[PDB]
From a paper:
Many bacteriophages depolymerize the CPS of their host bacteria through their tailspike proteins (TSPs). We demonstrate here that the K1 lyase from the NTUH-K2044-K1-1 bacteriophage is a polysaccharide depolymerase that cleaves the CPS into oligosaccharides of 1–3 repeating trisaccharide units with the retention of the pyruvylation and O-acetylation. The structures revealed a compact, rod-like, trimeric molecule with an overall length of ~ 128 Å and a diameter of ~ 86 Å at its widest part. The structures not only exhibit typical features of bacteriophage TSPs, such as the central β-helix and the C-terminal β-sandwich domains, but also contain unusual features, such as an N-terminal collagen-like trimerization fold and a striking protruding domain from the β-helix.
The purified K1 lyase crystallized in the P1 and C2 space groups. The P1 crystal contains two trimers of the enzyme in an asymmetric unit, and the C2 crystal has four. Only limited structural differences between the two crystal forms were observed, with an average root-mean-square (rms) deviation of ~ 0.25 Å between all Cα atoms, indicating a rigid architecture of the enzyme. Although the trimeric association is similar to that of human collagen XVIII, the N-terminal domain of the K1 lyase has fewer stabilizing interactions. Compared to the P1 structure, a slight rearrangement occurred in the C2 crystal, indicating the flexible nature of the N-terminal domain. The “rider” protrudes into the neighboring subunit and interacts with the “front feet” and its adjacent T3 turns. As a result, the three “rider” domains contribute 27 H-bonds and nine salt bridges, despite the modest buried interface (~ 1340 Å2). A virtually identical interaction was observed in the C2 crystal. To identify the catalytic neutralizer of the uronic acid, we modeled a pyruvylated glucuronic acid to the reducing end as the − 1 site and found candidate residues such as Arg333, His334 and Arg397. Indeed, in the C2 crystal form, a citrate molecule was bound to this − 1 site with its carboxyl groups forming H-bonds to all three candidate residues.
Author numbering:
A (entry chain C), B (entry chain B): 8 to 651
C (entry chain A): 10 to 651
The structure:
Amino acid sequence: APERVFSDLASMVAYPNFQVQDKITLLGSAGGDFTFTTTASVVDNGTVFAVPGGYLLRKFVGPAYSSWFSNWTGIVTFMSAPNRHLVVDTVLQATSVLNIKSNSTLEFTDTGRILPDAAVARQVLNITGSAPSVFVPLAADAAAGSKVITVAAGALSAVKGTYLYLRSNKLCDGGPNTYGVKISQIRKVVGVSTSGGVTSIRLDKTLHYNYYLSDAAEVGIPTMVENVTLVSPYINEFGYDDLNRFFTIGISANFAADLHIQDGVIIGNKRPGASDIEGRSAIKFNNCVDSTVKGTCFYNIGWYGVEVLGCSEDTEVHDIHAMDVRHAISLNWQSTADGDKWGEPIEFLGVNCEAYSTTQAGFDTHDIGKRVKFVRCVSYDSAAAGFQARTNGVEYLNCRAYRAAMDGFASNTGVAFPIYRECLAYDNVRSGFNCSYGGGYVYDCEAHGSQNGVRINGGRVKGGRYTRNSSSHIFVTKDVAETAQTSLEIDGVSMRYDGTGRAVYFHGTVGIDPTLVSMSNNDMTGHGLFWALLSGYTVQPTPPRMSRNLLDDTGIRGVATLVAGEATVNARVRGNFGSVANSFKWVSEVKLTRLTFPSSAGALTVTSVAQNQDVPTPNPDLNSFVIRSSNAADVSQVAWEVYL
Amino acid sequence: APERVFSDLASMVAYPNFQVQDKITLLGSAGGDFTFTTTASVVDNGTVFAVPGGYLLRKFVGPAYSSWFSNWTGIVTFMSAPNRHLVVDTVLQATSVLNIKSNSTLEFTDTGRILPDAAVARQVLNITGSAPSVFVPLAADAAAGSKVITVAAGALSAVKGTYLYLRSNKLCDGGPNTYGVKISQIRKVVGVSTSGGVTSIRLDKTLHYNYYLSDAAEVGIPTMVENVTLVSPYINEFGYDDLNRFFTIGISANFAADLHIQDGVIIGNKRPGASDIEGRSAIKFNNCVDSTVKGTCFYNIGWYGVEVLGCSEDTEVHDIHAMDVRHAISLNWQSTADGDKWGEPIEFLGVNCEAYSTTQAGFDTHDIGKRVKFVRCVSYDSAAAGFQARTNGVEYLNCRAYRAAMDGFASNTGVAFPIYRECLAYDNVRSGFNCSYGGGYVYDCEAHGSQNGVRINGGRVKGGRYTRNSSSHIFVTKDVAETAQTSLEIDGVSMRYDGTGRAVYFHGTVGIDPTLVSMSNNDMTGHGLFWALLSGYTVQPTPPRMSRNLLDDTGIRGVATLVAGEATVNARVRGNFGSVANSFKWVSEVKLTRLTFPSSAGALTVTSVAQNQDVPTPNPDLNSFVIRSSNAADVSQVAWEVYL
Amino acid sequence: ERVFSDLASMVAYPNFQVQDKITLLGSAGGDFTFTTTASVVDNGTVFAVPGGYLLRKFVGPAYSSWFSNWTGIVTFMSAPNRHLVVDTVLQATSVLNIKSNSTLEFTDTGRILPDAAVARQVLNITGSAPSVFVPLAADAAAGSKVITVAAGALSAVKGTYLYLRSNKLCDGGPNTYGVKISQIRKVVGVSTSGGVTSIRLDKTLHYNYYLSDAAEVGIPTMVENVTLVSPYINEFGYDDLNRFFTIGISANFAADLHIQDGVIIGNKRPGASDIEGRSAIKFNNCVDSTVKGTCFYNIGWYGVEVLGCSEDTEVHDIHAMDVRHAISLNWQSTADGDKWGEPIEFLGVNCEAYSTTQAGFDTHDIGKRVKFVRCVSYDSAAAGFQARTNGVEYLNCRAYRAAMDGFASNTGVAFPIYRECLAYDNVRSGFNCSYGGGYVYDCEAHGSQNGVRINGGRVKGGRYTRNSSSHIFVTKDVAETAQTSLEIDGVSMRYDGTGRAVYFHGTVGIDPTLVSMSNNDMTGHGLFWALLSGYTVQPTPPRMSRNLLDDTGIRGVATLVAGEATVNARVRGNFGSVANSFKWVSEVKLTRLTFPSSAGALTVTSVAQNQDVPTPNPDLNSFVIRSSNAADVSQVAWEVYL
């Protein structure tokens, strides 16, 4: 006195003559210090409470806490304004969507949880801006690289620091784009200037496509939700499936800039091991810029872990863990069955992500999107592929895929040249790398334990090591005979024999011309006569160009001494001189160099290749060739080396 | 009673009855609880207020908040002592520099800003130590790799856990060091032992140079500012240019250890698009150790985004985003025009940084600095190069340069061997990689859409793939004829013909000898007789050594059958036998190997190469060569393969 | 208005009543409530007083400055769901144990100073192994999402863990102590049917759990979600107060343990010798846990020790100075009985070790899927990196000035992979993998006695310079080890005034024909590209294709005259028969440029090498192109290789 103290809220709210300078205190589960006022205030029953005469305002600096609030509704209310920092330190029971606004932070303590409504499977968190409500056209073409776009003076108000959404009817070009999605981008206004009836707006970042007037290039002002941080969000909890408690999408964002999601866990918008539900993504970024997800764990998810779509630019996914999901990460298309759509993701980075037991590819893109990179990601036990590229030129560095039901890494129909650098595939059922749909670049990669190491129709396999492939290490083939075969270069690969499949398998069945392949400097040791596998040929095909490969490691070098311009040499010289259709006619390259220089030196040649035919098993140490001189007096000492 | 409660500052400061045992409270926009005292106390009108009889001390645990201070001056006062943790939760209007001291934390809420003084363009934050006042000489020479240094006993007091500054008159050796900067290093004392009039000081990290007594090797005690953390600094704000509100240097650090800057945004110390202003770097690290910048966004900066100079050691820059700046990151030299200068950066890492529209190179070093690495950095639309290396052996991993006005990646005058690993250059005007000033190592790189893929005078181009280069993929040239051509190895490179430039271009004009190049196992498919481009030669030069390259993919392998020692084969065998100055004399390498072994077998050779001359366009499938045996009776079946 | 001037006062007042306003001034300041409900005293948040207790009122975290002594802190942290900020300098006299869902956070000022009277452990995060196991109902192969046990056999609660094990031996490396396999998994699905319960796991199984191996499973007690933010353990000057500790932060059966930044110093005297088991941070059977940015000084044992079946462990951006090993993956001694667990899936990235008494980064002989990415070692007393488990992979790592080798494997270790690694001034060698082969890809070694020591595998690419003996030394650790095929392709082994290109070790049975050298730059080594020693019979050389030996006098055009032409070029060779030498000659590639009717088959003969004194002039070496047709007058283009 002047000191008011209550032991419950019902008390504090029921007091009838609060004075604007009372010292008000509340003791209990939501306790604290309040201030009376008659100023109109938004009631949320957490920070602002209604009472006879007016309101009670909580006194505090720093963030607010969920444990202050009477109910989920109050939470929702409190978060509906921008600039709000909340710490979820209690177990919230959701009955509606929670929308986050600009410059807001939702932070979880280890105890905090948002549990979805068991009565209605719906969305949990929305971070939601909106597309511009009117567009104006560009006053002139703006090429890729432009820092400035121009509009008619007066046409729109370009406020420095805000965003713009541009679009045209030019199609997205990251990949095949079969839905014919159109181009768009989001940029920030950092400079504005009018002169001569044109406004020039300088953008933060340059344009990545041609924005032409012939394509109806326009621009408008989107309402963006910016600067949102979700710290350790915990959505749902184990045992959700016995309560039949689900949700649709966990965290859905659209038109958001600088949305950063750190750690947290998201569980169960499907039953464990259950099948997939279209659209039930854990986190969804649609038209998001400069947004990231780092270290979040996803369990038991109906659709994608992280879904990136629209003109999402500069998005990073780091260190995530996803178990029992359709795709850990997926860059998506948009169906235009119901009209026009704009945006493919541009500049996407996945780094250090782990996916287990996905029902479809572990890490995937659809058929649009530009500049996609996967770095040090790994896939385990996928029901499909470890990694699937469906847009053009996806890059993978040091990725790994184990025990995929299908392929470790794969492109798809009409996709062009993914790049795999030092990627490892282990024990995937069908193949390590399947890029027979339209070439690939397989550089310093490894594939072990599949039917075939690499399935390829054109491109390059440079370096790397292949083992334990039942059929062959490299399989030259196509997805369908209508696809084109192109040049294939196989240079510096270890494709040794280890008692399983052969080195290379040429697929005659679908129109493979072996001469379109060049094999240089590869270690094919131990395959003997069975380095190649051929099938589907009706005429013996010409073999590929083959320079200095290794086929054997014994009796592959030596010195002979000519006698009357001849010398028989026992070595592991080999060849096939038959004419079976599915086979090559070939023979060992034998490099000859003279080491003594008699006056009767003649021109050297290899003739009479003989191969031991013992039974049941032939002995290659008894193969032999003859070194013959063009001079019949030759008694040179000649060094020899056997290659393939 | 015994408690006195006020309703604003003015009242609470005036009241004269304050006694050491009152409980004191304040209502209002900076409310709290206080404790009166009469000990000395530094006023800041935040946590300490001067009053009749003594000073009121705000009592709180945790950090302080900017919202409690009356003005910028008290904030500055507050942060002027070490061990401060302040949360900027308001928009501060600066009118002086803010110095941060050791063990302090400056932290911004989404709302917090520091706006620079519109009246005076000055620096914003300083983190400033000082060089030593006096030096003592080393008792003995101390070689690179020394864990210990020695000084005369009692020369200086080395306190364990503090730092030392070492220097000599040896010149920095990282690069050309044209200003003649001298070596210096900073080390932390972790062990001390005195014996026989000689103190041995153990360092945390070893020495990276040789500190000799003949070079005046000496050592003193710098005053360091250590363990400072800036969390999410927001300096200036969009629209600054319309208020003519700027600043010079955003965050300046000298003699700092463990300065960590986390996210935040720094805007406009220049107008948008405007020209550069010397020295207006957003962040500057001079003589800093183990300091970092991570995730900060830079807009409209007159100088460098992050400027690193001095003997700054072990600095890392991660995930930055720099738009409209001179250099996103620059390691600097020091001008010695007005005196001796010490220190080059040692151990630098830039990773996953993004630069847009820089007025000069996106990522730059000057001509000093050791161990400089760029990992997965990207430059867009530079006015100069994407990447500029002016110190020796700068290493680039998986970096990307798009659409630079000049070269994607380049070194410079007297700069030696940068190393490019799996770096990609798209649509840079002049070249992808320009390392003609003094050699390069270009490993598995890619350059598309330039005049020349790579300009190089010596080094290696190993693997990689080059497309859409109007002049040539590899251009063997020099910056100036005085510069020395060294050996160049071009191995396994894809330089296919795509309707633009040639494969290799040899620059006779600046003294290029083509026999100092070896081309081995490259894919030159489709260039026909035009794989080389020569100019500036007065005399037909000898060609480089060429081993097993590919020039066509049709008519390049078959079997022929001799008849009376001969056979004419139709194949894309090729050559130039002319003697024109700007061309080579050359011919295909045709590999021949026998497949049937008659008694008339002789030595094989190629002769009579003939090349169809149809008009208007020649048809190389009517080209031909002859296989002839030294034995006129030979009827062997000879396999053949055509290489370059 | 119950207001006290200090502590003692607030704890002597007999009158506290159910609902008052209690306030404390002074250094421990705060507001309190009264109650008689049992509470656990800690003289920080809970106080004992005549009549019952006083509870401090607060939201958010608790502060060390609130506490009377180290003991209450320990009490406070001994319950789960605690958040404490160490904003003071705490003086420890016991071990502090941290429990599930807790966070210990230090301000720039906070410290935990170890007991100077007793060297002990500082922080413990410890769970415990399962008290009982039940056997698996059926075999569970690698890749299984599920395991089965008899219905009723154990209660699998969703969200909790399982510890599985079998008598199968760990298979990551040589595993000489014969450690057995185990793994910890989270239950995410449970279903019972036909007397058999099927448990679904978060992650799949990485071994074969067979019944023939007594595969069994049990319910460990884990400590989960612990975060240590900037821990400061000890302080410089500790050695003058003789203040140490044993293990700084020791964890066992922890899940999601994260240590961020911080400093740990002095469980050993500066520069002093090592003390067994005194690791700064130790992770034993921990899952999904990490250490990022922490600094280590003066550590008796290892910086970060990872042992047991720790799976999915990562260490980033640490700096370790004067430690045994900055990171070590360990084995478990079985001398005193059976042991379970090798690390699986370990990532080291961007880590820096300075001045280690032993390897900078090491594993022992168990461990699967181990990766070091961009780590660097400076001045190790031993190796920079030592791999003792099979297939360790290094990406872009660097070793400077190690007393022995920049990178090495060890006895019975198989094929480490080095990708774009850099070795500078390591005394003995850059890469030493002569124990069981190696894959050395685009690596670089400068300033050792030998660039690469290797018995088998591959050197592809890379560049080697300033190696006194040779760039590549083909050798074994011991003659009993097998030599396998070695490929040396595309390597730059240029002569620069020091060593030779390749050194074949006859002394330990190296047969050079098991080596192939293709497309290498061996420019400048002249007749001395190879070094041999220990041979008693001239051995046959390795297969060699198109390498480069000189860069002058190596391409021309010659004109035949009556079937012959004497060419001056840098053709070379040895035709001698000294045991320690090869019999070899340059590869001279011939192509015809004019096609006279008299054209015949070409050959190289009459190789001659200038013998001037003191120093020979190789520009006067020569060879002869000869045609099989004596009339031949062709122009012949020639190129000289090795």
